[PDB]
Amino acid sequence: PDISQSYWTVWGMRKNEALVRFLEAEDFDAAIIFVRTKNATLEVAEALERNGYNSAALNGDMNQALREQTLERLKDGRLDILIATDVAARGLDVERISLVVNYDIPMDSESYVHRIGRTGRAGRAGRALLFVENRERRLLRNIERTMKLTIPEVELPNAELLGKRRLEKFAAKVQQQLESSDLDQYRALLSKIQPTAEGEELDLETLAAALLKMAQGERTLIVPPDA
Amino acid sequence: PDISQSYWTVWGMRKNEALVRFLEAEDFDAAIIFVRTKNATLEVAEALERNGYNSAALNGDMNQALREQTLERLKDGRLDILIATDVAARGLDVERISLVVNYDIPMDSESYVHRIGRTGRAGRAGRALLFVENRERRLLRNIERTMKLTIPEVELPNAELLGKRRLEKFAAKVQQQLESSDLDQYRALLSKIQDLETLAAALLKMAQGERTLIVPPD
């Protein structure tokens, strides 16, 4: 019945890059990204795709066949993220949605409320994240009195946070590999991998660091220092 | 032009898994796989691709621009394997083909010669490999007779040889990462995961990719 709401002040990076950071930064089942216009839905969708998420745009004038296809692909898990306008998302009950992103802050403050109500609609608790430009403080205040709540401000998730999130999911794949049965056959190959021709010392720790680098996913475990 | 020729009696595994085995076992640049049915043109295709190769069909029903685009993708390296029928391959020429596989035995000697000729061009060294089912040995003997020459029989590349190949390629990738600049940053992350040897073995399993280094027998 409850939605946890926060907002970020657009400061350090553009909205696209921040969205990817916020998505990676904490767990979500499915998410809906609300934007001002159809053109925005396409720019978001392409940023999310060149960052490794399965997402699609819902638009008010889209083919009704594609709408039904897109909505069920979200239900069965071929999609995790929809990018929608207020027009397109009316009539949308999808229980996977655990995260609502107000990518563009609305002027109508009850558009805000109807937007974050696409989650927490179950007995489950969901989350809502609002992007606010400094130019837009007035509409945040509008929202924050239209409902008597103050929306707490979050910071942009930092490199160290993202590295820890990546390490923790990587460690979970490591753990399912240790439960393997053939693990001992792999132990015997460790000595066989190593270059002994120019300067030899079977240095297990240096080998394992090379193997970690080769085993890490596309999301590098060494996140560049900033932000 | 030579062009060493050999043939495999189809035995103990199906032609598709066997082709994957022969492809891994020896270096090739680009390869062309000759089949008879243009369904096989398409099915061998994504047998090769689910084993990680870049391959495309080349059949009589996909023309004439899509042909010549497919060949240029083969020639510039965006593809490494064409699966062709004889019709769709009257016009040659790619100069990357070092391997011709007669996946389906030709119906006559002249066809076999034609197919072989796609390699060994510009006088460079090339290889031809023929698949012969038991029931087709007449066809093979027909080809051998007409041609005045026998084709050497070869064994399936065995599991140990495959393990050796996969290990060799992997250890050369490992060496590269052992000389990379940022390695100490990764060194510090080992303690944070949850003994070294056990962790490294599991990392090896995750780093090796799809070509598993532990090859089961056969």
From Swiss-Prot, chain A:
<feature type="domain" description="Helicase C-terminal">
    <location>
        <begin position="15"/>
        <end position="162"/>
    </location>
</feature>
<comment type="similarity">
    <text>Belongs to the DEAD box helicase family. DeaD/CsdA subfamily.</text>
</comment>
<comment type="subunit">
    <text>Interacts with the 50S ribosomal subunit upon shifting to 15 degrees Celsius. Also found associated with the RNA degradosome at 15 degrees Celsius; binds RNase E (rne).</text>
</comment>
<comment type="function">
    <text>DEAD-box RNA helicase involved in various cellular processes at low temperature, including ribosome biogenesis, mRNA degradation and translation initiation. Exhibits RNA-stimulated ATP hydrolysis and RNA unwinding activity at low temperature. Involved in 50S ribosomal subunit assembly, acting after SrmB, and could also play a role in the biogenesis of the 30S ribosomal subunit. In addition, is involved in mRNA decay, via formation of a cold-shock degradosome with RNase E. Also stimulates translation of some mRNAs, probably at the level of initiation.</text>
</comment>
<protein>
    <recommendedName>
        <fullName>ATP-dependent RNA helicase DeaD</fullName>
    </recommendedName>
</protein>
Curated annotation (Swiss-Prot), chain B:
<protein>
    <recommendedName>
        <fullName>ATP-dependent RNA helicase DeaD</fullName>
    </recommendedName>
</protein>
<comment type="function">
    <text>DEAD-box RNA helicase involved in various cellular processes at low temperature, including ribosome biogenesis, mRNA degradation and translation initiation. Exhibits RNA-stimulated ATP hydrolysis and RNA unwinding activity at low temperature. Involved in 50S ribosomal subunit assembly, acting after SrmB, and could also play a role in the biogenesis of the 30S ribosomal subunit. In addition, is involved in mRNA decay, via formation of a cold-shock degradosome with RNase E. Also stimulates translation of some mRNAs, probably at the level of initiation.</text>
</comment>
<comment type="similarity">
    <text>Belongs to the DEAD box helicase family. DeaD/CsdA subfamily.</text>
</comment>
<comment type="subunit">
    <text>Interacts with the 50S ribosomal subunit upon shifting to 15 degrees Celsius. Also found associated with the RNA degradosome at 15 degrees Celsius; binds RNase E (rne).</text>
</comment>
<feature type="domain" description="Helicase C-terminal">
    <location>
        <begin position="15"/>
        <end position="162"/>
    </location>
</feature>
